[PDB]
């Protein structure tokens, strides 16, 4: 096959590039939460 192979390396491209910016979610964002109700819990 040579044609679902297209679906292979594209996921090998896409998902890793899709894996990317969630490191900034781990990276960028003491206090975290500011609501009067949120601190009741």
């Amino acid at each position: 096959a040579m044609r679902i192979v297209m679906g292979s390396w594209w996921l090998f491209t896409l998902i890793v590039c899709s894996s990317y910016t969630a490191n900034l979610a781990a990276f960028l964002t003491p206090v975290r939460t500011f609501q009067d109700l949120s601190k009741q819990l």
Binding site: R3, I4, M6, W10, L11, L14, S18
Partner: peptide
């Protein structure tokens, strides 16, 4: 992202159908 594989999927199924179309060209000839 939510639909990154979705938009490319039907493109791949279009590319999937050309192979079996040439195999029906073989089933005719």
């Amino acid at each position: 992202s939510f639909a990154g594989v979705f938009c490319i999927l039907a493109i791949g199924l279009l590319l999937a159908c050309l192979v079996a179309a040439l195999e029906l060209w073989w089933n005719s000839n």
